[PDB]
Amino acid sequence: KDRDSQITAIEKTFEDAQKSISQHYSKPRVTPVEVMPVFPDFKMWINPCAQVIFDSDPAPKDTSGAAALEMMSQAMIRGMMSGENLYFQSGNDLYFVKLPNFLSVEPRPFDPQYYEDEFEEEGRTRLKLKVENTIRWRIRRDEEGNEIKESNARIVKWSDGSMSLHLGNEVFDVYKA
């Protein structure tokens, strides 16, 4: 397809991912128990669980520990760049995603002006992998000075105990291991 059409379709995966998830696509009685956006990274926010103090009367706060630290692993980056693999964080947790040959990730934030049109049935499976089936993220600056990170992708845990990966519109059955 045209370069413009690829980019328009990629941008749509972003819009589709923000659409409200309310019921399972094949099981309309099944409802979402947790929705986690997927931001591929080699970095983690972590809270100390406790400060150890030498004063019996400390500066009062709601919660033991402290504000979050950012930590990183050089290991996590190989994998996302081979497009075979990815890590992401949700709450205090680290998830590892093992990618099948029919999905991919792009680690660098998406910017359309640098998007390369590689297409002047095994060329169609290729055009679809990179437009519909590639996990991506982008990064925006508001008119109110806010920085907005957006992802293509969502991991959903369902009311029946199952899990799916939403990539834009498309749905992939997924399993916890």
Ligand X SMILES: C[S@@+](CC[C@H](N)C(=O)[O-])C[C@H]1O[C@@H](n2cnc3c(N)ncnc32)[C@H](O)[C@@H]1O
DSSP labels, 2-26: -HHHHHHHHHHHHHHHHSPP-S-SS
Shortest distance, position 36 Cβ to ligand X, whole Å: 7
Which of 37, 84 has the CB closer to ligand X?
A: 37
List residues binding ligand X (CB under 6 A): 17-21, 32-35, 37, 154
Q: How far is the CB of 155 from ligand X (least distance, A)?
A: 10
* 32 or 107: CB nearest ligand X: 32
Are 125 and 101 in contact by the 8 Å Cβ rule? The answer is: no
Least distance to ligand X from the beta carbon of 17, Å? Answer: 6
Q: Which is nearer to ligand X, 84 or 132 (CB)?
A: 132
- Joined together, the tokens standing for residue 101 give 């040959």
Q: How far is the CB of 88 from ligand X (least distance, A)?
A: 13
Tell me which residue of 118, 145, 114, 144 sits closest to 131, measured CA to CA.
118
- Tell me if 150 sits within 8 A of 141, measured CB to CB: no
CB 113 → ligand X: shortest distance, Å?
Answer: 26
Measured from the CB atom, the residue of 34 and 117 that comes closer to ligand X is 34
Return the residue matching tokens 């990064």.
139
Q: Residue number with the shortest CB distance to ligand X?
A: 35
| DSSP track, 23-74 | S-SS-TT--EEEEEE----SEEEE--S----S-SSPPP-SSSS-SPEEEE-S
Q: Shortest gap between Cβ of 84 and ligand X (angstroms)?
A: 25
Closer to ligand X by Cβ: residue 77 or 90: 90
Residue type at position 140? R
Residue bearing tokens 């809270």: 47
Which residue's CB is nearer to ligand X, number 19 or number 124?
19
